[PDB]
Amino acid sequence: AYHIDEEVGFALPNPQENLPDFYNDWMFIAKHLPDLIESGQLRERVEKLNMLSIDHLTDHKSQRLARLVLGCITMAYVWGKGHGDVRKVLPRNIAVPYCQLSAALELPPILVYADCVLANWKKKDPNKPLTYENMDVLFSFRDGDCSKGFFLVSLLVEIAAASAIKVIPTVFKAMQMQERDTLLKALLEIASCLEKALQVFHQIHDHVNPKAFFSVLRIYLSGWKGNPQLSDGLVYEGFWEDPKEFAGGSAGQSSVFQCFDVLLGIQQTAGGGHAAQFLQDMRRYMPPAHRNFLCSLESNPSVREFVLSKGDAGLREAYDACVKALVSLRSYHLQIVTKYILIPASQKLEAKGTGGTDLMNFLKTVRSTTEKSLLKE
């Protein structure tokens, strides 16, 4: 369909954990990144790899795992230990398979949200539910980086959003079959589920330490677009001649928030402002099927103009309960950014620095664009 699952939403259902034996030399390096980065053998280990053909990867789930393996290796190679000794050329034995596979999955050749959260997980017990206690990630960068907590919590917020995503068919059908009562029950279920996704978001404090995120994990998630340590981008040796720039990972790459924006007719990606340009660009980092779902929603008739035209106050209050749950999420998110970036940065990403300023201004603009779509203030 649009690769949307009814249980896990945009998450890859039950990711694959093992690659064919043909790829053992890839898998060994990814499984041992904390150790290999710590000693400083990681970059040697990459430079001595053979060139493995991607032809022995024979389905989507196996391609997704291979992207996740190669994306983590690539971040470990470029940033190394995390202190400024960078590499600007990615050796051909990684770059050629990584670029070929990325072109086939229609994704930029850099680690994205959909690799390290949406496919980087397993159930411990396949019988018991999708809870933190029954889950684990497949790969980590450094001992102590809190990557399990950070990836698993993001995932659980995605799985929470799933119960709301499966109501979107009901909304477009109720509109055209002119079914007022079922449209209203649907809009309230969406809002109920966005409110539950916010409470799951609170669990990030239970599992992620600000100091570990800011001084360790954040560095391996960063990219090479507008990054002065790699001001021209990365050379993907043997595939493109010139360096190329790609952005680092963020849940701006999550289809979740963008999809309820389109649904509720809130015009973020609309305009030429720098906030609209960012959010549109982050769509190039989403899997193609999810990109297409988003664009499909953009073309269907407007839920906002429907509600606005029917003089029906219960409909307007149900629409508003959806707009409100997005403002809440985005406001809790500002708090999150303050606690995990602005405050640790003060111990150039500080609140009044050049980075911490443009990012808070972007986030506050998106939240305030959302808040304006309220029908009742």
Ligand X SMILES: NS(=O)(=O)NCCSc1nonc1/C(=N/O)Nc1ccc(F)c(Br)c1
Query: Which chain residues interact with ligand HEM by CB under 6 A?
Result: 154, 157, 208, 213, 250-252, 254, 257, 330, 333, 336-337, 340-341, 359, 362-363, 366
What is the footprint of ligand X within residues 163-222 (CB under 6 A)?
205, 207, 209-211, 218, 221-222
150 or 239: CB nearest ligand HEM? 150
Smallest distance, Å, CB 45 to ligand HEM? 30
Question: What number of other Cβ atoms are within 10 A of residue 15's Cβ?
Answer: 16
The number of residues that bind ligand X (CB under 6 A) is 23
23 or 340: CB nearest ligand HEM? 340
Q: Decide which of ligand X, ligand HEM, none touches 263; Cβ closer than 5 to 8 Å per partner kind.
A: none
CA distances for 204 relative to 153, 293, 324, 351, angstroms: 6, 28, 21, 21
Smallest distance, Å, CB 67 to ligand X? 13
Site string for ligand X, 227-266 (x = CB under 6 A): ---------------------xxxx---------------
User: What is 249-288 written as a DSSP string?
Assistant: P-GGG-HHHHHHHHHTT--SS-SSSHHHHHHHHGGGGS-H
138 or 342: CB nearest ligand HEM? 342
Range 190-222 burial, b when 16+ CB lie within 10 A, else e: bbebbbbbbebbeebeeebbbebbbebbbbbbb
Two structure tokens written together for 342: 């602005």
Kind plus residue range of the DSSP H or E element containing 195: helix 180-201
308 or 336: CB nearest ligand HEM? 336
Q: Decide which of ligand HEM, ligand X, none touches 209; Cβ closer than 5 to 8 Å per partner kind.
A: ligand X
| Helix, strand or coil, per DSSP, at residue 291 | helix
Smallest distance, Å, CB 218 to ligand X? 5
Smallest distance, Å, CB 92 to ligand X? 26
Angle value at C-alpha 309, between 320 and 374, nearest 5 degrees: 25
Percent helix, percent strand, percent coil in the chain, to nearest 5: 60, 5, 35
Count CA atoms within 13 Å of residue 155 on its CB side. Answer: 30
Q: Decide which of ligand X, ligand HEM, none touches 188; Cβ closer than 5 to 8 Å per partner kind.
A: none
Q: Decide which of ligand HEM, ligand X, none touches 82; Cβ closer than 5 to 8 Å per partner kind.
A: none
178 or 354: CB nearest ligand X? 354
Smallest distance, Å, CB 310 to ligand X? 36
Q: After which residues is the chain broken (C to N over 2.5 A)?
A: 347
* 192 and 40 Cβ atoms separated by less than 8 Å: no
CA distance 344 to 323: 31
CA dihedral 181, 184, 190, 195 (to 10 degrees): -120
2 or 362: CB nearest ligand HEM? 362
Question: What number of other Cβ atoms are within 10 A of residue 254's Cβ?
Answer: 23
Smallest distance, Å, CB 7 to ligand HEM? 17
Residue whose CB is nearest to ligand HEM in the complex, by number: 250
Two structure tokens written together for 44: 């040697």
Smallest distance, Å, CB 153 to ligand HEM? 6
Q: Decide which of ligand HEM, ligand X, none touches 308; Cβ closer than 5 to 8 Å per partner kind.
A: none
Site string for ligand X, 46-75 (x = CB under 6 A): ------------------------------
15 or 210: CB nearest ligand X? 210
- The number of residues in the chain equals 377
CA distance 86 to 78: 6
CA distance 369 to 330: 11
Question: Is 333 labelled a binding residue?
Answer: yes
The region of 148-156, 258-266, 269-277, 290-298 touching ligand X under the rule CB under 6 A is 148-156
Q: Decide which of ligand X, ligand HEM, none touches 157; Cβ closer than 5 to 8 Å per partner kind.
A: ligand HEM
Contact status: 339 vs ligand X (CB under 6 A): yes
- Binding-site residues for heme b sit at 333
- Binding-site residues sit at 333
